[PDB]
Amino acid sequence: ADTIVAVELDTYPNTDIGDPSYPHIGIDIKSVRSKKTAKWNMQNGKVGTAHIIYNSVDKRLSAVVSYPNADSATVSYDVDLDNVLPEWVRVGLSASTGLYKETNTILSWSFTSKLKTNALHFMFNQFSKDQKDLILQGDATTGTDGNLELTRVSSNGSPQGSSVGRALFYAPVHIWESSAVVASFEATFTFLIKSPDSHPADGIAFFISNIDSSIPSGSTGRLLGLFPDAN
Amino acid sequence: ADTIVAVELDTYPNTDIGDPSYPHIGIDIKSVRSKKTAKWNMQNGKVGTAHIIYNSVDKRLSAVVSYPNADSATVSYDVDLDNVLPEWVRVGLSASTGLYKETNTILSWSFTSKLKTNALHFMFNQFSKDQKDLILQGDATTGTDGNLELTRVSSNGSPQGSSVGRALFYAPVHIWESSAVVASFEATFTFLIKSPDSHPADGIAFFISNIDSSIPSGSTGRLLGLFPDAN
Amino acid sequence: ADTIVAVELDTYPNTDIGDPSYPHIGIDIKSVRSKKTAKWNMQNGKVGTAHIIYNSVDKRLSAVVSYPNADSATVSYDVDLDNVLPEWVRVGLSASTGLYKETNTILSWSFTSKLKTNALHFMFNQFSKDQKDLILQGDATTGTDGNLELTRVSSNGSPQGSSVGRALFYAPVHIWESSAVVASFEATFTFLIKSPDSHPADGIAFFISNIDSSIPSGSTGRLLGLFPDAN
Amino acid sequence: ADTIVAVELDTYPNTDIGDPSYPHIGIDIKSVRSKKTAKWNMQNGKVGTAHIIYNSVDKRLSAVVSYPNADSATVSYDVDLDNVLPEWVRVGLSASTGLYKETNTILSWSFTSKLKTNALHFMFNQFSKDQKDLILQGDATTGTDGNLELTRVSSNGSPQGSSVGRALFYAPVHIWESSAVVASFEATFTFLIKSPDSHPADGIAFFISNIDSSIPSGSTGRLLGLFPDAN
Ligand SMILES: CO[C@H]1O[C@H](CO)[C@@H](O)[C@H](O)[C@@H]1O
Ligand SMILES: CO[C@H]1O[C@H](CO)[C@@H](O)[C@H](O)[C@@H]1O
Ligand SMILES: CO[C@H]1O[C@H](CO)[C@@H](O)[C@H](O)[C@@H]1O
Ligand SMILES: CO[C@H]1O[C@H](CO)[C@@H](O)[C@H](O)[C@@H]1O
Ligand SMILES: [Ca+2]
Ligand SMILES: [Ca+2]
Ligand SMILES: [Ca+2]
Numbered sequence: 001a002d003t004i005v006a007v008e009l010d011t012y013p014n015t016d017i018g019d020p021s022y023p024h025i026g027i028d029i030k031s032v033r034s035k036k037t038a039k040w041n042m043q044n045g046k047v048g049t050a051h052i053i054y055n056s057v058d059k060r061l062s063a064v065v066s067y068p069n070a071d072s073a074t075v076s077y078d079v080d081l082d083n084v085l086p087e088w089v090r091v092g093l094s095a096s097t098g099l100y101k102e103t104n105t106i107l108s109w110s111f112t113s114k115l116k117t118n119a120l121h122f123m124f125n126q127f128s129k130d131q132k133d134l135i136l137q138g139d140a141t142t143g144t145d146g147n148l149e150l151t152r153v154s155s156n157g158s159p160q161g162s163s164v165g166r167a168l169f170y171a172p173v174h175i176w177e178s179s180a181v182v183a184s185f186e187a188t189f190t191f192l193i194k195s196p197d198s199h200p201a202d203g204i205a206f207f208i209s210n211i212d213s214s215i216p217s218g219s220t221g222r223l224l225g226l227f228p229d230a231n
Numbered sequence: 232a233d234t235i236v237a238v239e240l241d242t243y244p245n246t247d248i249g250d251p252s253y254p255h256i257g258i259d260i261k262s263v264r265s266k267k268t269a270k271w272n273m274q275n276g277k278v279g280t281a282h283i284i285y286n287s288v289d290k291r292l293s294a295v296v297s298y299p300n301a302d303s304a305t306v307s308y309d310v311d312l313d314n315v316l317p318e319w320v321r322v323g324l325s326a327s328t329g330l331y332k333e334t335n336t337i338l339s340w341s342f343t344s345k346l347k348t349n350a351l352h353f354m355f356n357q358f359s360k361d362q363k364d365l366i367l368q369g370d371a372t373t374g375t376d377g378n379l380e381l382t383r384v385s386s387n388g389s390p391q392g393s394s395v396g397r398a399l400f401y402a403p404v405h406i407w408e409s410s411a412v413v414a415s416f417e418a419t420f421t422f423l424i425k426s427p428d429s430h431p432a433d434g435i436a437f438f439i440s441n442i443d444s445s446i447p448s449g450s451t452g453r454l455l456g457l458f459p460d461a462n
Numbered sequence: 463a464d465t466i467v468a469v470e471l472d473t474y475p476n477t478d479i480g481d482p483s484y485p486h487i488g489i490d491i492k493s494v495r496s497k498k499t500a501k502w503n504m505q506n507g508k509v510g511t512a513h514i515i516y517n518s519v520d521k522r523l524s525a526v527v528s529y530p531n532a533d534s535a536t537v538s539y540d541v542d543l544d545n546v547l548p549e550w551v552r553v554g555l556s557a558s559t560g561l562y563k564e565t566n567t568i569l570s571w572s573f574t575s576k577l578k579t580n581a582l583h584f585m586f587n588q589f590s591k592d593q594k595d596l597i598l599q600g601d602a603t604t605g606t607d608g609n610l611e612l613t614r615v616s617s618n619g620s621p622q623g624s625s626v627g628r629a630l631f632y633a634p635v636h637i638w639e640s641s642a643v644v645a646s647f648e649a650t651f652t653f654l655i656k657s658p659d660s661h662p663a664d665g666i667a668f669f670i671s672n673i674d675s676s677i678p679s680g681s682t683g684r685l686l687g688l689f690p691d692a693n
Numbered sequence: 694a695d696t697i698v699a700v701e702l703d704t705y706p707n708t709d710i711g712d713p714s715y716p717h718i719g720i721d722i723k724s725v726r727s728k729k730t731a732k733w734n735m736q737n738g739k740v741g742t743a744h745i746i747y748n749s750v751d752k753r754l755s756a757v758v759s760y761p762n763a764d765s766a767t768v769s770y771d772v773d774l775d776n777v778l779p780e781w782v783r784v785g786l787s788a789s790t791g792l793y794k795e796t797n798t799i800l801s802w803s804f805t806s807k808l809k810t811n812a813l814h815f816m817f818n819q820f821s822k823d824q825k826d827l828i829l830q831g832d833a834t835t836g837t838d839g840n841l842e843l844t845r846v847s848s849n850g851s852p853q854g855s856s857v858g859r860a861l862f863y864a865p866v867h868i869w870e871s872s873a874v875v876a877s878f879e880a881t882f883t884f885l886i887k888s889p890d891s892h893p894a895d896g897i898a899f900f901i902s903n904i905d906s907s908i909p910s911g912s913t914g915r916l917l918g919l920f921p922d923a924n
């Protein structure tokens with residue numbers, strides 16, 4: 001199977017796989033069962049901001065998710081990514097729906113990696129219909145209002161159930177190296193999760209993977225397009 | 232055929248295809264016969280710096296090539312790259328040898344493109360044996376002393392004749408867009424051209440191409456790995 | 463007197479001092495009588511964007527001023543800033559009103575200078591009530607809605623006549639050096655010029671000055687807070 | 694008294710004020726008696742690199758000090774800088790000598806601060822004789838070989854005892870804000886500490902201070918130009 005490290009914005013509690021009983025953010029290391037979670041007051045129809053940070057000094061993967069004029073949710077987990085990921089990775093955004101659904105709209109995405117110095121930075125403040133520096137997988141589309149729709153939306157703007165989609169940056173990223181004095185990365189994205197129902201599902205993740213990562217077959221719903229099973 | 236825009240550091244005068252009778256820098260628009268050239272005092276065995284700049288306001292492609300404690304060579308050409316290149320491109324470094332030879336050693340390479348904002352930046356201050364964000368074509372290799380050798384060198388660094396090699400950044404670049412108020416790019420690389428002979432050949436280019444560009448058949452020597460013919 | 467280089471967004475034609483008979487953008491080199499101007503379709507009450515660029519290779523000062531979904535205005539002038547400005551400068555925004563008036567509201571301001579490398583970058587996407595990295599001169603205030611008001615506005619945002627104000631970045635900038643292979647700078651700001659009258663005045667400038675520059679006595683109205691006289 | 698947060702590269706053990714019995718790096722919060730230290734294998738006459746990082750999510754101040762082809766020294770301390778520093782600060786480099794001495798040569802210095810976004814970045818890869826974006830205090834000088842000499846060196850290159858000097862970046866920095874979702878800073882500098890004696894003293898610090906900070910009178914030797922006493 002693929003190797004996944006992810007920050008999940010989990011809109012739907014699957015208590016049977018160790019989700020807490022509320023919308024949450026989590027750090028996932030090679031399992032959909034988050035190593036750590038924090039409560040997340042998701043705001044249906046409001047534009048949110050996610051910031052993810054890691055450096056090779058602290059070896060702490062941290063995420064902050066916020067909306068204007070509201071308290072942030074934050075989660076951190078000590079992990080040595082050198083012992084989990086291959087040296088070269090791709091970075092991406094993933095989303096899913098199941099029997100419940102939501103828009104998984106990305107309005108912007110930036111990423112910076114630095115290895116001491118080699119550097120990579122990309123910034124998307126808009127997505128075009130033919131975004132050739134993105135690998136779109138499953139139901140992911142670009143161009144509609146200059147946004148990235150990770151999961152399927154009908155002609156009338158309604159989100160579809162049992163959908164899964166991902167966008168990976170085209171270039172592989174050197175995420176760690178033994179010869180590195182300091183390695184760091186950050187990602188930011190803005191998202192709009194809307195549900196006609198007051199039961200939205202299933203969420204959005206920022207993930208890092210083996211370069212050849214693809215949607216595991218059947219990874220709709222609670223598996224967020226990341227994992228083949230709930231182990 | 233490919234679509235090429237390039238800045239050439241041409242170490243060998245091919246007077247039969249319109250080269251001036253001295254080492255020169257040139258701006259190449261879809262031809263190896265430079266639209267504009269300037270005299271270049273190439274310094275055998277010394278580390279040089281090349282800077283290339285363009286913005287959609289001035290629509291002027293400019294390059295400066297320099298060595299420490301020596302006068303710069305500079306060349307500029309008015310061109311609307313919107314009318315020459317496709318919207319999506321790859322960016323690269325190319326080098327060749329022929330009957331005469333030289334090391335085509337790259338010690339560092341950076342690039343920034345901005346479309347008003349979407350942005351791409353990479354910086355290589357060292358190259359690793361397995362540099363997965365580079366597409367190596369022909370004789371180009373990485374890892375030897377942390378450098379990028381565009382053309383063939385022996386175990387002792389001695390350069391071989393009839394060699395051609397290129398390195399393209401893995402991700403496609405959005406170099407222009409009609410809805411853009413301002414588009415800009417800049418590139419820097421440091422190079423070491425050494426020749427045992429007092430007749431070095433054939434040179435190094437920074438180039439921008441169609442995303443699927445490859446070394447044209449036969450394009451060793453004066454064609455610099457860029458062009459199928461001398462038209 | 464001070465040494466000024468500026469890009470003016472001139473909302474009010476002073477035909478008696480060589481303004482063309484319409485709102486215009488201009489390049490000012492040590493005089494309010496622009497060395498070059500272009501027609502500017504200023505849009506009362508709409509947020510606009512100004513981009514200013516210069517590099518030591520082309521030695522061309524260029525500016526583009528635009529509104530969403532409208533054609534740009536652009537102006538360029540060939541000037542060797544090495545022969546005009548001192549080596550060390552301050553960078554700033556200036557605005558004035560006279561008998562006629564307008565809001566001179568700055569919503570954002572960024573600047574980058576590079577000398578080949580020494581570098582300086584600042585980005586203001588909001589201004590606080592106590593913005594200690596800004597020198598406010600004359601009527602300029604910060605904090606109201608997180609904006610920079612260069613000229614006087616009432617409690618309800620209504621603009622006052624005979625006002626002049628400037629904001630300079632606190633740190634001096636090394637804009638040129640003889641030992642530099644390449645020097646470049648860029649500035650971006652977003653502005654909101656609103657007038658209850660259909661005769662707005664007098665405009666906004668981005669300027670570069672001697673480090674100790676201050677508002678010349680009397681420099682309200684057509685002198686834009688930049689010049690002691692109309693010579 | 695001033696408010697100081699610093700990372701010290703302490704070359705001289707003052708066992709009487711709680712220094713460990715070896716050259717060390719430390720995190721100083723309003724005292725020269727480091728809240729945390731790590732062993733540092735200082736290499737007389739070799740160019741070293743120091744990296745300092747902090748973000749408002751982890752609230753961890755970390756430093757890594759390294760030489761090429763040697764193991765790094767690293768130190769971290771959990772501190773909420775929001776509870777220690779004023780909102781606006783200056784950032785600087787400090788060094789001292791006492792009865793024992795050393796060159797306190799800075800070859801380069803970069804700093805980035807970001808408040809979510811407002812940003813500040815400066816990079817010095819060389820210092821000029823008249824570096825107007827630096828406030829030099831005490832014995833600090835610029836221009837000699839393009840370096841920053843924090844403490845006094847004689848005409849013959851010999852370091853002098855009982856010397857103290859600092860360089861602060863001219864612009865105040867917004868290092869924290871209550872409305873900030875994420876605040877971060879990083880600093881990098883390269884240094885050359887040479888001693889003829891083989892008993893070097895006293896060290897170099899990166900520090901953050903109240904904007905009006907100045908060398909405490911008598912703060913030569915073990916006080917590193919930062920503190921008035923050893924409390
Ligand atoms: C009720 O179960 C289904 O729907 C939910 C909500 O979408 C998913 O989490 C889950 O994997 C299933 O597809
Ligand atoms: C004279 O013949 C060769 O001359 C140089 C030497 O490298 C090349 O430019 C050219 O294409 C030929 O191969
Ligand atoms: C009569 O003109 C006055 O008003 C205009 C525009 O306000 C200014 O340009 C001018 O200097 C005077 O102050
Ligand atoms: C021996 O004591 C003196 O010299 C050393 C190092 O120079 C300092 O630490 C100390 O403060 C005194 O000035
Ligand atoms: Ca879930
Ligand atoms: Ca040639
Ligand atoms: Ca006017």
Ligand SMILES: [Ca+2]
Nearest residue numbers: 703705706707
């Ligand atoms: Ca000590």
Ligand SMILES: [Mn+2]
Nearest residue numbers: 010019026034
């Ligand atoms: Mn979960």
Ligand SMILES: [Mn+2]
Nearest residue numbers: 241250257265
């Ligand atoms: Mn040529």
Ligand SMILES: [Mn+2]
Nearest residue numbers: 472481488496
């Ligand atoms: Mn005018």
Ligand SMILES: [Mn+2]
Nearest residue numbers: 703712719727
């Ligand atoms: Mn100590």
